[PDB]
Enzyme design. Structure first.
Site, short mmCIF file in Angstrom:
data_model
loop_
_atom_site.label_atom_id
_atom_site.label_comp_id
_atom_site.label_asym_id
_atom_site.label_seq_id
_atom_site.Cartn_x
_atom_site.Cartn_y
_atom_site.Cartn_z
N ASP A 121 23.91 26.03 -9.62
CA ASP A 121 23.74 26.65 -10.92
C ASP A 121 25.05 27.21 -11.47
N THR A 159 19.68 26.80 -17.94
CA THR A 159 19.15 26.19 -16.69
C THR A 159 17.92 25.33 -16.83
N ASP A 261 26.44 30.58 -10.71
CA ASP A 261 25.97 31.17 -11.97
C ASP A 261 25.94 32.69 -11.97
N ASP A 308 24.09 22.33 -13.41
CA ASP A 308 23.25 22.29 -14.61
C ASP A 308 24.05 22.54 -15.91
N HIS A 414 26.55 31.32 -20.88
CA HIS A 414 26.50 29.90 -21.16
C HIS A 414 25.30 29.64 -22.08
N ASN A 673 13.39 12.69 -35.75
CA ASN A 673 13.06 12.31 -34.37
C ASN A 673 14.20 11.50 -33.71
N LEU A 675 15.17 8.62 -34.57
CA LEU A 675 14.82 7.21 -34.58
C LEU A 675 14.75 6.67 -36.01
N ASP A 677 13.71 5.46 -39.38
CA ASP A 677 12.46 5.65 -40.12
C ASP A 677 11.87 4.28 -40.52
C1 LIG Z 1 14.01 9.60 -25.64
O1 LIG Z 1 13.16 8.87 -24.78
C2 LIG Z 1 11.80 9.21 -24.96
C3 LIG Z 1 11.00 8.50 -23.86
O2 LIG Z 1 11.06 7.10 -24.03
C4 LIG Z 1 11.34 8.88 -26.39
O3 LIG Z 1 10.13 9.58 -26.62
C5 LIG Z 1 9.02 8.70 -26.84
O4 LIG Z 1 8.98 8.26 -28.17
C6 LIG Z 1 7.95 7.33 -28.39
C7 LIG Z 1 8.12 6.71 -29.77
O5 LIG Z 1 7.93 7.70 -30.76
C8 LIG Z 1 6.60 8.02 -28.24
O6 LIG Z 1 5.63 7.01 -28.38
C9 LIG Z 1 4.41 7.53 -28.92
O7 LIG Z 1 3.48 7.81 -27.90
C10 LIG Z 1 2.36 8.49 -28.42
C11 LIG Z 1 1.52 9.04 -27.26
O8 LIG Z 1 2.37 9.46 -26.20
C12 LIG Z 1 1.65 10.27 -25.24
O9 LIG Z 1 1.60 9.64 -23.97
C13 LIG Z 1 2.89 9.41 -23.42
C14 LIG Z 1 2.82 8.58 -22.14
O10 LIG Z 1 2.12 9.28 -21.12
C15 LIG Z 1 3.60 10.75 -23.17
O11 LIG Z 1 4.89 10.48 -22.67
C16 LIG Z 1 3.67 11.60 -24.44
O12 LIG Z 1 4.19 12.90 -24.13
C17 LIG Z 1 4.61 13.60 -25.33
O13 LIG Z 1 3.58 14.42 -25.84
C18 LIG Z 1 3.10 15.39 -24.93
C19 LIG Z 1 1.96 16.14 -25.61
O14 LIG Z 1 1.95 17.50 -25.25
C20 LIG Z 1 4.23 16.35 -24.55
O15 LIG Z 1 3.84 17.21 -23.50
C21 LIG Z 1 5.48 15.61 -24.10
O16 LIG Z 1 6.50 16.59 -24.05
C22 LIG Z 1 5.83 14.51 -25.10
O17 LIG Z 1 6.19 15.13 -26.32
C23 LIG Z 1 7.31 14.49 -26.96
O18 LIG Z 1 6.94 13.39 -27.77
C24 LIG Z 1 6.00 13.70 -28.78
C25 LIG Z 1 5.66 12.43 -29.54
O19 LIG Z 1 4.84 11.60 -28.74
C26 LIG Z 1 6.54 14.79 -29.71
O20 LIG Z 1 5.54 15.21 -30.61
C27 LIG Z 1 7.03 15.99 -28.89
O21 LIG Z 1 7.64 16.92 -29.75
C28 LIG Z 1 8.01 15.52 -27.83
O22 LIG Z 1 9.14 14.95 -28.45
C29 LIG Z 1 2.28 11.67 -25.08
O23 LIG Z 1 1.44 12.48 -24.29
C30 LIG Z 1 1.58 7.50 -29.29
O24 LIG Z 1 0.48 8.15 -29.93
C31 LIG Z 1 2.47 6.91 -30.37
O25 LIG Z 1 1.83 5.79 -30.98
C32 LIG Z 1 2.47 5.52 -32.24
O26 LIG Z 1 2.81 4.17 -32.39
C33 LIG Z 1 1.74 3.30 -32.22
C34 LIG Z 1 2.24 1.86 -32.32
O27 LIG Z 1 1.51 1.03 -31.43
C35 LIG Z 1 0.63 3.59 -33.23
O28 LIG Z 1 -0.52 2.82 -32.95
C36 LIG Z 1 0.24 5.07 -33.23
O29 LIG Z 1 -0.65 5.36 -34.29
C37 LIG Z 1 1.52 5.89 -33.36
O30 LIG Z 1 2.10 5.63 -34.61
C38 LIG Z 1 3.81 6.47 -29.81
O31 LIG Z 1 3.63 5.32 -29.02
C39 LIG Z 1 6.47 8.68 -26.87
O32 LIG Z 1 5.38 9.57 -26.82
C40 LIG Z 1 7.74 9.45 -26.49
N1 LIG Z 1 7.74 9.80 -25.08
C41 LIG Z 1 8.09 11.03 -24.69
C42 LIG Z 1 7.88 11.39 -23.25
O33 LIG Z 1 8.58 11.86 -25.46
C43 LIG Z 1 12.33 9.35 -27.46
O34 LIG Z 1 12.09 8.78 -28.73
C44 LIG Z 1 13.78 9.08 -27.06
N2 LIG Z 1 14.70 9.72 -27.98
C45 LIG Z 1 15.64 9.04 -28.64
C46 LIG Z 1 16.35 9.79 -29.74
O35 LIG Z 1 15.91 7.86 -28.41
O1 LIG Z 2 14.76 25.76 -5.69
C1 LIG Z 2 14.92 25.87 -7.09
N1 LIG Z 2 14.88 27.11 -7.71
C2 LIG Z 2 15.04 27.05 -9.07
N2 LIG Z 2 15.07 28.18 -9.97
C3 LIG Z 2 14.97 29.49 -9.40
C4 LIG Z 2 16.18 30.30 -9.75
N3 LIG Z 2 16.50 30.30 -11.17
C5 LIG Z 2 17.67 31.11 -11.53
C6 LIG Z 2 17.78 31.24 -13.02
C7 LIG Z 2 16.78 31.92 -13.73
C8 LIG Z 2 16.85 32.05 -15.14
C9 LIG Z 2 17.94 31.50 -15.84
C10 LIG Z 2 18.95 30.81 -15.13
B1 LIG Z 2 20.35 30.15 -16.04
O2 LIG Z 2 21.61 29.91 -15.30
O3 LIG Z 2 20.13 29.63 -17.42
C11 LIG Z 2 18.87 30.68 -13.71
C12 LIG Z 2 16.46 28.97 -11.74
C13 LIG Z 2 15.25 28.18 -11.37
S1 LIG Z 2 15.26 25.44 -9.51
C14 LIG Z 2 15.13 24.77 -7.92
C15 LIG Z 2 15.17 23.40 -7.43
C16 LIG Z 2 15.50 22.26 -8.37
C17 LIG Z 2 14.90 22.09 -9.63
C18 LIG Z 2 15.25 20.97 -10.42
C19 LIG Z 2 16.17 20.05 -9.94
CL1 LIG Z 2 16.62 18.66 -10.88
C20 LIG Z 2 16.76 20.22 -8.68
CL2 LIG Z 2 17.89 19.07 -8.08
C21 LIG Z 2 16.41 21.33 -7.89
CA LIG Z 3 12.81 8.92 -37.87
ZN LIG Z 4 21.84 27.53 -14.81
ZN LIG Z 5 23.08 31.64 -16.09
#
Ligand SMILES: *[C@@H]1O[C@H](CO)[C@@H](O[C@@H]2O[C@H](CO)[C@@H](O[C@@H]3O[C@H](CO[C@H]4O[C@H](CO)[C@@H](O)[C@H](O[C@H]5O[C@H](CO)[C@@H](O)[C@H](O)[C@@H]5O[C@H]5O[C@H](CO)[C@@H](O)[C@H](O)[C@@H]5O)[C@@H]4O)[C@@H](O)[C@H](O[C@H]4O[C@H](CO)[C@@H](O)[C@H](O)[C@@H]4O)[C@@H]3O)[C@H](O)[C@H]2NC(C)=O)[C@H](O)[C@H]1NC(C)=O
Ligand SMILES: O=C1N=C(N2CCN(Cc3cccc(B(O)O)c3)CC2)S/C1=C\c1ccc(Cl)c(Cl)c1
Ligand SMILES: [Ca+2]
Ligand SMILES: [Zn+2]
Ligand SMILES: [Zn+2]
Ligand SMILES: *[C@@H]1O[C@H](CO)[C@@H](O[C@@H]2O[C@H](CO)[C@@H](O)[C@H](O)[C@H]2NC(C)=O)[C@H](O)[C@H]1NC(C)=O
Ligand SMILES: *[C@@H]1O[C@H](CO)[C@@H](O[C@@H]2O[C@H](CO)[C@@H](O)[C@H](O)[C@H]2NC(C)=O)[C@H](O)[C@H]1NC(C)=O
Ligand SMILES: [K+]
Ligand code: NA
Length: 789
Positions: A121, A159, A261, A308, A414, A673, A675, A677
């Site tokens: 860290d 972190t 850290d 990190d 940081h 996003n 991406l 449009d």
């Molecule tokens: C970085 O790389 C990532 C990963 O490849 C890209 O993110 C992806 O972007 C695509 C395209 O937009 C998204 O596809 C859409 O998928 C949805 C449904 O997706 C659900 O299931 C998947 C698979 O299990 C999950 O990964 C998704 O998880 C998201 O939502 C949950 C909900 O709580 C959240 O916890 C996660 O954090 C994650 O959120 C993030 O993405 C959402 C948008 O999905 C956004 O709102 C949020 O703020 C976060 O950014 C999710 O559970 C699906 O409905 C869509 O369908 C659309 O297109 C089809 C075409 O066939 C149509 O039919 C339909 O009507 C829609 O128009 C999309 O397929 C994908 O979700 C997303 N994956 C993740 C993990 O984010 C980034 O774009 C990349 N970034 C760059 C800049 O390149």
């Molecule tokens: O054993 C672990 N303990 C973790 N903690 C516990 C201690 N935390 C200290 C901390 C708390 C709040 C803010 C910060 B900061 O520096 O922004 C750091 C950070 C989260 S992460 C972790 C294991 C871990 C988690 C993710 C990855 Cl990718 C890898 Cl390689 C290892």
């Molecule tokens: Ca866009």
């Molecule tokens: Zn940290």
């Molecule tokens: Zn710190």
């Protein structure tokens, strides 16, 4: 509920998935207080410390001891890590010469090299400069293995967003951990780093490495460790797991340390007090390496040493207060410190007036140490907008400063902009799959997940790394990338229309028969092949003496415009008679063209050109620059930037880099996003027309890495810098914009630097398809960010 009277006999640090009502004995059990009553006494033994002493050699095995120096300890896998050094005349790993590991040297039963991730860290990249004087074990890893001079974290440089990014390959806006602290307006819930909520799975998105592994039949050791477990015990546990039966032994492991850290925050990055924690970390590394050596695994395991984020000098005296700018700060909530996020104290408070707040925060002090942004206006390279957990109103804070709501035990902090030097962190890879004594260019932490997947033979979940961009880190197990398929083929229109077919309201003061074939235009101005269009659409290649473009019949403008400027090229002015010149393009239907009337009507929108008239090769050729198919809609505010770039900077770049190839174009990202449009997502047009208004304009500037060769005759590797400039109606972002453009435009552009890969996401284009270089090398080129630090 947890029945705590259970026992941790023969269960210490079990890899057993166990929940309620049963007792737990795993490395997270304390964090849920779900440990069996005897976990502490049986599993957290501390007796006689962590090192064998000469008097302990050959001892009778006392199970009370933290670690053992008994004759049997080696097979049981619980020697103290220095056992053989003290009792068997062996050397510490650090004292042995480095020898190249060409193939894995693993015991029988090992099918693949294990992977151990040693995370630290707040390990600022420049701490490495301290060398073996302070960190001899780490310095051996670094010089014998593969190292980058630094690894770029994600923004915010704290972190939780960074650790989860390392684990998923995703930007925070995608994985959901957009901060150490967050408010989710849909959950109406607050995430705190320490507290109950963070254990709820609903916050965490994407698929972390340990899940990717498990789902593909690869066993992971638990990545997290309850904070009370000492580092020495974490190491002993990893080693013990490595001595497990073949049918139980995990393939991937993680260690974590909260240092340096903690000391960095107290004493600052350049504090003399930083030496001690750094020695302590090195000692932990030495224990691991000594332990692996005892186990005959030091030429078998791949080790990743990674941070990190870094650490900056930050003190109480350098705090800006929002109460100096705003009248009622008690009505807003602020996520403070090295960044700012603002929302009303009462969620959805109707009287919340963000435009007025921003106005009061915009350039109000000459030395102002932060800048307000609506999130969609943040530099695209930060990828910090597309998540409901990111407040609309953001403050980017200047390095070394804090922002607080209203009115010293710390010297370091940081969280700043991830291109800031102090925020950069460390990467070292050591082992059979890594290269020997090899330095690689700095890279972004989003790329690591793919590589860790490769190291473990896994298929990565969809993520934001570019798979193959880091192939040059590896001896084997590289990933063979494949060029994406062109989806839309271009047309090559000739003359198909008469000047009289056109009714655009355009005018220009232009021999008839002398009034555009390929020829040598492609080889001069299009050096790396045409970009491929990776979505379904209709577009035309248009050739000119000075430039080529791929003109879109749907969006009424080029998707890309490409041209080369030689070192000696001449900048010329626009003749007075041509100031307002726009010429119809007879290769393109009037129905697929813009028109000058819409611009005359639109009192706020003006226009620019993608190929600059200032760099035409001749007065005759200059007329090409005024084609309606080279025209793009630009606000007057933006034009101050664009004309300065075109008229002054491109030539400067050509002079400095021995010629340059330039590819410029529009970007549409109305939903922020990151991406391209689709048509339906565009929200703004030139007044009374169907001409879409870009949210940004990009430029990709390429030359020969070997600057002694001209850009158009380059034999080898390329050099690139790019930007994505926000298309905005004012220059409020630039506090010095009242002055000449020489005093503020380059500063703006530097802030909006970008990777070619960023532009590819935003445009649906694929660049550099035709080069003399490997595809992997090109992928590396596309992920490069020119940072200006
Ligand atoms: C970085 O790389 C990532 C990963 O490849 C890209 O993110 C992806 O972007 C695509 C395209 O937009 C998204 O596809 C859409 O998928 C949805 C449904 O997706 C659900 O299931 C998947 C698979 O299990 C999950 O990964 C998704 O998880 C998201 O939502 C949950 C909900 O709580 C959240 O916890 C996660 O954090 C994650 O959120 C993030 O993405 C959402 C948008 O999905 C956004 O709102 C949020 O703020 C976060 O950014 C999710 O559970 C699906 O409905 C869509 O369908 C659309 O297109 C089809 C075409 O066939 C149509 O039919 C339909 O009507 C829609 O128009 C999309 O397929 C994908 O979700 C997303 N994956 C993740 C993990 O984010 C980034 O774009 C990349 N970034 C760059 C800049 O390149
Ligand atoms: O054993 C672990 N303990 C973790 N903690 C516990 C201690 N935390 C200290 C901390 C708390 C709040 C803010 C910060 B900061 O520096 O922004 C750091 C950070 C989260 S992460 C972790 C294991 C871990 C988690 C993710 C990855 Cl990718 C890898 Cl390689 C290892
Ligand atoms: Ca866009
Ligand atoms: Zn940290
Ligand atoms: Zn710190
Ligand atoms: C909580 O844990 C203890 C230990 O496992 C359980 O105590 C045992 O209970 C069984 C069934 O009643 C007895 O036969 C054993 O003699 C007990 N063992 C010991 C060593 O105490 C107890 O049942 C558990 N409580 C629950 C299930 O709620
Ligand atoms: C923006 O700043 C101005 C001060 O420049 C604030 O205006 C003051 O507001 C209070 C109450 O509204 C008045 O009594 C003062 O007379 C105002 N001062 C001046 C010089 O106008 C304004 O409140 C700030 N806006 C926000 C949202 O904080
Ligand atoms: K106008
Ligand atoms: Na301004």
């Amino acid at each position: 509920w947890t029945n705590t009277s259970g026992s941790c006999k023969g269960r210490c640090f079990e890899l057993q998935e166990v929940g309620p009502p049963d007792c737990r004995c795993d490395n997270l059990c304390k964090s849920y207080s779900s440990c069996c009553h005897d976990f502490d006494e049986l599993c957290l033994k501390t007796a006689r410390g962590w090192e064998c002493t000469k008097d302990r050699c050959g001892e009778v095995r006392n199970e009370e001891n933290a670690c053992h120096c008994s004759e049997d300890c080696l097979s049981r896998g619980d020697c103290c890590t220095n056992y053989q050094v003290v009792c068997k005349g062996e050397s510490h790993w650090v004292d042995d010469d480095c020898e190249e590991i060409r193939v894995p040297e693993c015991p029988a039963g090992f099918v693949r090299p294990p992977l151990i991730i040693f995370s630290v860290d707040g390990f600022r990249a420049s701490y490495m400069k301290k060398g073996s004087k302070v960190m001899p074990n780490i310095e051996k890893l670094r010089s014998c293995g593969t190292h980058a001079p630094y690894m770029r974290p994600v923004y915010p440089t704290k972190t939780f967003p960074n650790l989860y990014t390392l684990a998923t390959g995703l930007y925070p806006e995608s994985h959901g951990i957009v901060g150490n602290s967050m408010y989710d307006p849909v959950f109406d819930a607050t995430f705190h780093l320490r507290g109950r909520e963070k254990f709820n799975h609903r916050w965490w998105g994407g698929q972390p490495l340990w899940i990717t592994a498990t789902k593909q039949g690869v066993r992971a050791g638990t990545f997290f460790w309850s904070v009370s477990i000492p580092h020495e015990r974490r190491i002993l546990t990893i080693l013990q797991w490595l001595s497990l039966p073949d049918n139980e032994r995990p393939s991937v492991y993680a260690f974590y340390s909260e240092q340096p850290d903690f000391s960095g925050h107290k004493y600052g990055p350049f504090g003399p007090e930083m030496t001690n924690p750094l020695r302590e970390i090195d000692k932990t590394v030495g224990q691991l390496m000594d332990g692996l050596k005892q186990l005959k695994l030091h030429r078998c395991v791949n080790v990743i040493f990674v941070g990190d984020h870094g650490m900056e000098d930050v003190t109480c005296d350098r705090t800006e207060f929002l109460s100096n700018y705003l009248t009622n700060v008690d009505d807003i909530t602020l996520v403070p410190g090295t960044l700012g996020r603002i929302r009303p104290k009462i969620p959805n408070n109707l009287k919340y007036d963000p435009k007025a707040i921003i106005a009061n925060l915009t350039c109000k002090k000459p030395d102002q140490h932060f800048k307000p942004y609506m999130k969609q206006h943040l530099p695209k390279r930060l990828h910090y907008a597309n998540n409901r957990r990111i407040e609309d109103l953001h403050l980017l804070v200047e390095r070394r400063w804090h922002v607080a709501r209203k009115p010293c035990f710390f010297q370091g902090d940081h969280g700043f902009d991830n291109k800031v030097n102090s925020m950069q962190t460390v990467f070292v890879g050591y082992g059979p799959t890594f290269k020997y004594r090899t330095k690689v260019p700095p890279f972004e932490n989003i790329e690591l997940y793919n590589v860790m997947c490769d190291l473990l033979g896994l298929k990565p979940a969809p993520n934001n790394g570019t798979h193959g961009s880091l192939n040059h880190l590896l001896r084997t197990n590289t990933f063979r990338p494949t060029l994406p398929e062109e989806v839309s083929r271009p047309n090559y229109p000739g003359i198909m229309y008469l000047q009289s077919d056109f009714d655009l309201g355009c005018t220009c003061d232009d021999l008839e028969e002398l009034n555009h074939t390929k020829g040598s235009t492609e080889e001069r101005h299009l050096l790396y092949g045409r970009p491929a269009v990776l979505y379904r659409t209709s577009y035309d290649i248009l050739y000119h003496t000075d430039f080529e473009s791929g003109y879109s019949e749907i969006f009424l403008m080029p998707l890309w415009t490409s041209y080369t400027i030689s070192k000696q090229a001449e900048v010329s002015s626009i003749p007075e008679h041509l100031t307002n010149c726009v010429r119809p393009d007879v290769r393109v239907s009037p129905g697929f063209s813009q028109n000058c009337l819409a611009y005359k009507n639109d009192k706020q929108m003006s226009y620019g050109f993608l190929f600059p008239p200032y760099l035409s090769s001749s007065p005759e050729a200059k007329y090409d620059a005024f084609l309606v198919t080279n025209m793009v809609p630009m606000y007057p505010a933006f034009k101050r930037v664009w004309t300065y770039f075109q008229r002054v900077l491109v030539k400067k770049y050509a002079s400095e880099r021995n010629g340059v190839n330039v590819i410029s174009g529009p970007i549409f990202d109305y939903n922020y996003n990151g991406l391209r449009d689709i048509e339906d997502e565009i929200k703004q047009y030139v007044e009374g027309s169907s001409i879409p208004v870009p949210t940004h304009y990009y430029s990709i500037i390429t030359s020969c890495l070997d600057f002694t060769q001209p850009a158009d005759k380059c034999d080898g590797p390329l050099s690139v810098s790019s930007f994505i400039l926000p298309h905005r109606p004012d220059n409020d972002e630039s506090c010095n914009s009242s002055e000449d453009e020489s005093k503020w435009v380059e500063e703006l552009m530097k802030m909006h630097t970008a990777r070619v890969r960023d532009i590819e996401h935003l445009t649906g284009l694929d660049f550099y398809r035709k080069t003399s270089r490997s595809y992997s090398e090109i992928l590396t080129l596309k992920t490069y960010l020119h940072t200006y630090e």
